Structure 1
């Protein structure tokens, strides 16, 4: 079971929220919905979020926040501290442009590193009931 207006995949529920929110603000928003920024650590979870991005007309540059973060030099999922294993970086990413690209988001439907105060839409996940 997933809540109404959310998209189901295996044991997860996702939702796209149109916003102009920093990564931190987006996290706070997902937490109020009982969830977290989406952490697509499998190829198929990414395909589902990508489909949602296309559905919401957010398939180009400065696509939505995801829950990956760069702590020091290490790319990891926020909720778990897990180092990225499966990767979905876009071509020539990550590139750390301007030196402060410490948050994960979709850029042209691929992962990119972006400055965390950039204002974007966001994707949340929660456990299915």
Structure 2
């Protein structure tokens, strides 16, 4: 049971929203769903599955928001937390560069069409982007 254009995986129905939403706005919205919340990514197969789910979004969109943020919130004197707001703990990795390379980037990660949506890039948790949302029953 999953909406059209929606695809199930692990244990939640995923749906793409061509509607932009701050990482904090899609997080709170996809949260209003049955334990839903910005798409998750704890497996090398899910990171590639979500990419194919948003790889046909449209040239009018190259990046996509996901449920990944920086638990350091500007504290970890190094930058090595990265936690999914809809998956659990960092059990999977696929970021382009570590936040310790740039002067503390934003506190939210998004997909970058440049890497075929197979890499996460930091972005201002406020910039809104087309996003995905997972949610079981």
Q: TM-score, normalised by structure 2?
A: 0.76
Task: Spell out the pairing of 1:82-101 with structure 2 (5 A cutoff).
Answer: 82=89, 84-90=90-96, 93-95=97-99, 97=102, 99-101=104-106
Query: Any conservation in 2 of the 1:60–1:107 contact (CA below 8 Å)?
Result: no
**Structure 2 equivalent of residue 125 of structure 1:** 134
**Cα RMSD between the aligned structures?**
2.4
Residue 78 in structure 1 maps to residue 85 in structure 2: yes
Could you list the per-position Cα deviations for residues 18-45 of structure 1 after superposition, in whole angstroms to 9, with x for gaps in the alignment?
1222111111221234321011110111
Q: TM-score, normalised by structure 1?
A: 0.80
In the alignment, structure 1 segments of 5+ residues that lack a partner are none
For 1:64, what is the secondary structure of its paired residue?
strand
**Structure 1 equivalent of residue 69 of structure 2:** 69
Deviation at 1:121, TM superposition (A): 1.1
Task: Spell out the pairing of 1:45-56 with structure 2 (5 A cutoff).
Answer: 45-56=46-57
